């Protein structure tokens, strides 16, 4: 790996500089290098890894949606034929997106998840595994689409089972997991009633636990609760 000669601490320092400069491809390469040193990641380091790849794949997903929309219109009735270029370029961006998801899933499998024993780290990584299989499912159309969808579901479900046993209902990791699993049900699994039920139960159980929190923790939890409410308003 091209980061093999750089100190672990120097990689983490440069990931933070790259975030400040909005250089997210560099940030992701620095954090991949840090993971490949073989040591477990701290809470702060896990969040640097997630921020880096979320921004890279987020740009790819937005571009893919623009190109897919143009392609679908070109296949409508009455549209002038323009050749293979739209499909080719959508395929190019799709292949690059799939490569980024495969890179993240590979880091989780070698060997972040198997060394993660505490609930906060294990739930964080299983949620990430669900998220990157969900991004693969957004572009999947072939014989493997059902297995990709089940891999996302299975990862989210194991994370949910641990979070319900080991974390309070206001924990921000537990809340963000439930938010994203609810969107999986609505957008990917064609299960809008399951999506609405999960968001509502998660919101109500967090509301009843807010009284236990400090002012700073209350702010952290209510920010994610507002996203659950915004989705419920969109869906009902």
């Amino acid at each position: 790996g091209a980061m093999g000669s750089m100190e672990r601490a120097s990689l983490i320092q440069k990931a933070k500089l790259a975030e400040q400069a909005e250089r997210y491809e560099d940030m992701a390469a620095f954090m991949k290098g840090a993971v490949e040193k073989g040591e477990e990641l701290s809470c702060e380091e896990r969040n640097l890894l997630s921020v880096a790849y979320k921004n890279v794949v987020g740009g790819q997903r937005a571009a893919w949606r623009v190109l897919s929309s143009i392609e679908q219109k070109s296949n409508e009735e009455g549209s002038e034929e323009k050749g293979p270029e739209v499909r080719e370029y959508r395929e190019k961006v799709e292949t690059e997106l799939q490569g980024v998801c495969d890179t993240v899933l590979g880091l989780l499998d070698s060997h972040l998840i198997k060394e993660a024993g505490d609930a906060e780290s294990r739930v964080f990584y299983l949620k990430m595994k669900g998220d990157y299989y969900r991004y693969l499912a957004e572009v999947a159309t072939g014989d493997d689409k059902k297995r990709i969808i089940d891999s996302a579901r299975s990862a989210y479900q194991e994370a949910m089972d641990i979070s319900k046993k080991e974390m309070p209902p206001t924990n921000p990791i537990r809340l963000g997991l439930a938010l994203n699993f609810s969107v999986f049900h609505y957008e990917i699994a064609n299960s809008p009633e399951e999506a609405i039920s999960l968001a509502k139960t998660t919101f109500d159980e967090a509301m009843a636990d807010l009284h236990t929190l400090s002012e700073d923790s209350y702010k952290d939890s209510t920010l994610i609760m507002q996203l659950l409410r915004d989705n419920l308003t969109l869906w009902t």
Partner: peptide
């Protein structure tokens, strides 16, 4: 429109 998923920390 698209629903919200978990934002940056």
């Amino acid at each position: 429109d698209r629903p919200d998923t978990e934002p940056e920390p």
